[PDB]
Design a binder for this molecule. Structure first.
Ligand SMILES: [Zn+2]
Ligand SMILES: [Zn+2]
Ligand SMILES: [Zn+2]
Ligand SMILES: [Zn+2]
Ligand SMILES: [Zn+2]
Ligand SMILES: [Zn+2]
Lengths: 159, 159
């Protein structure tokens, strides 16, 4: 799994939308109740160089907002978390203005816990971003891949 | 959507397993409760040239067996059904001995109803069949794609 070189984490700040999702195990994304079925609303980088990830997630028959604190590490573009039974956030690529690709995994069991997403800044299907997502997914052993249509992209998590 | 030329429907008879699934709309396969989340157990061709499709499907908190009668039509490899809010079964390709690729759709709304599967005769992940599945999927506008691991392939529909 190759991460991004020369990530300036301050420039990913602002609103985002989850466009596409992929995972190594089907049950990680199967249904809205799935453990890693999460929709990113906002990335908030901190002065220390950490990354706060604001997202929506299905729980108790409703979409609830969660904040995840990703601590920076000695490896660039890799952040430590303690949520969703995952411990690492990996930023694969971003142009800052349009798209951002990232993955979540558990270091102990990366084959059974790898979930990757393609984010966009506006709720519009960007074919360029999807091409870069699929290109990055070639090396990884993914068993499920999702891509939201324009309607679903606007709705994100919803009942 | 291009169907198979020279299909001998008698030779698809016997046990099958659903290896991979793809659909044009996410909600068609999202979760076991999804309308087109079906697992093919057996294909039974009839003397008239029809195709009985035996499958398992989630309903009322349990996997229930369903039989679908696919009537042959003036087009080879295309069969008429009246189930799952679909009206057509399309056989894309098969070698008879290992794999079979097929799709289901509603003629009225093919973009919102297209669901395609890759079947294998034994519960073992066949990379060759998946390559042919993905090759056939290139032309179609799929928004979700699933591929079962060895464990899931053996379980098919299960609580
Ligand atoms: Zn601070
Ligand atoms: Zn910190
Ligand atoms: Zn579409
Ligand atoms: Zn008969
Ligand atoms: Zn008949
Ligand atoms: Zn695998």
């Amino acid at each position: 799994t190759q991460t991004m070189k020369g990530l300036d984490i301050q420039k990913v700040a602002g609103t985002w939308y989850s466009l596409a999702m992929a995972a190594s195990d089907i049950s990680l994304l199967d249904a809205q109740s799935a453990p890693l079925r999460v929709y990113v609303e906002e990335l908030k980088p901190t002065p220390e160089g950490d990354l706060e990830i604001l997202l929506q997630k299905w729980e108790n028959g409703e979409c609830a907002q969660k904040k995840i604190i990703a601590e920076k590490t000695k490896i660039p573009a890799v952040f430590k978390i303690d949520a969703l039974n995952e411990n690492k956030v990996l930023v694969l690529d971003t142009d800052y203005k349009k798209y951002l690709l990232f993955c979540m995994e558990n270091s102990a069991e990366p084959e059974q816990s790898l979930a990757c997403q393609c984010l966009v800044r506006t709720p519009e299907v960007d074919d360029e971003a999807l091409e870069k997502f699929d290109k990055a997914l070639k090396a990884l052993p993914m068993h499920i891949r999702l891509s939201f249509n324009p309607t679903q992209l606007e709705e994100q998590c919803h009942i």
